């Protein structure tokens, strides 16, 4: 993670989990890495058991989380003096959105008994609405690159974790040393054997 906090000051990092430094002390095996862009006025409702506009139509959170969100200001890469409609938000779903699952659709949503199969009626609205990102807009109407990480347990033995603070070497002195999972005490001496290369 050492190379994590050199990507401008963040926006919100409230967490219900473990510390970043003990992420180095505890070796993991599976972590989710997904990202999206939301307007800055709609990031505050990203919380476990939270209700808001983008709460049950694009992305929802369960109780057990093991992680938190990372967000920061992005006004020099996704903001244009004209228009920016590349990103869109969906707010029309028929039923409940399950936590941690993705959904993509293009069919028009029917809010009632109106039969719609490609026509935009007064009760049938398109479920995909685009944003608009201009420098005229203030802080509350700017895109934030919200990225969230979730950790998983009991899937595999640990296979991914950061540096272990390797040190220098000393010779001809009574000091403690440890090897590749082979811990012991002894005197390091150059050998004359012929090891096979496996």
């Amino acid at each position, epitope marked *: 993670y050492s190379v994590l906090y050199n990507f401008a000051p963040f926006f919100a990092f409230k967490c219900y989990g473990v510390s970043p430094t003990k992420l180095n002390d505890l070796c993991f095996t599976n972590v989710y890495a997904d990202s999206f862009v939301i307007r800055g006025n709609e990031v505050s409702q990203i919380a476990p058991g939270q209700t808001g506009n983008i709460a049950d139509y694009n992305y929802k959170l369960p109780d057990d989380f093991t992680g938190c969100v990372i967000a920061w200001n992005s006004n020099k890469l996704d903001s244009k*003096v*004209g*228009g920016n*409609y*590349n990103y869109l938000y969906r707010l029309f779903r028929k039923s409940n959105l399950k936590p941690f699952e993705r959904d993509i659709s293009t069919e028009i949503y029917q809010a009632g008994n109106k039969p719609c199969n490609g*026509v935009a009626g007064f009760n049938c609205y398109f479920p995909l609405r685009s944003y608009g990102f201009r420098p005229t807009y203030g802080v509350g109407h700017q895109p934030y690159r919200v990225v969230v990480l979730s950790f998983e347990l009991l899937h595999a033995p640990a296979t991914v974790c950061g540096p272990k603070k390797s040190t220098n070497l000393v010779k001809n002195k009574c000091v403690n040393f440890n090897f590749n999972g082979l811990t012991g005490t002894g005197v390091l001496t150059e050998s004359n054997k012929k090891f096979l290369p496996f």
Partner: antibody
Amino acid sequence: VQLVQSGAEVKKPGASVKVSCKASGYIFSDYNIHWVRQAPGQGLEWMGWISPDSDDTNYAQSFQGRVTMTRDTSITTVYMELSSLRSDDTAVYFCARSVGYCSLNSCQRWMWFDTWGQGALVTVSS
Amino acid sequence: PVLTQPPSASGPPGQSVSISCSGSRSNIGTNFVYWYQQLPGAAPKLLIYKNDQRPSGVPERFFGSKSGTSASLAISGLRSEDEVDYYCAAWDDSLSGHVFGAGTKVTVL
């Protein structure tokens, strides 16, 4: 906004023509430019968009290798290289000004063509 | 599919006329319809966008709307000093591009 350019010179079939319109008064890093021709007696046809930021330009189904698009940031003007002109190319050329920006294939429904002015003319000729 | 449009139109001055643009299921309704108008011997210009917002630069004279298969461009009255063709444009998901209508002549009576 302005689109002042020069008139296109007549080119033989199996050759190349160049049509380019000047862009000024705005930064050329957010507006994708479109090319389209006014076919007489019928509608118009489209081949793709041009993005001056990244190398992500695509092509239409009926226009695979007919057009080749090159970009330039020093002059902020798109450049034309047409190949194998035919008898159906008898139309005037206008560079379509499109507002906004869009890359993926579900965001192009929101924009509209902004500015037309002083188009050129490229048609095949025997 | 290709959008088709009336070749011409006959409307006397002083009374409102409208132009219809028949389409398909995936081209009209689920996608916005844009109306292009071009002067003879000059450059074209957009008339109406998104079927409910009027562009700046024109007075409150024209009107455009969509109703299912066809989109209607209401022309409240007609002046004999300006006769301009109207183009019909839409977007299709299968064709993945812009397809344009034939265009309609307007004449006085």
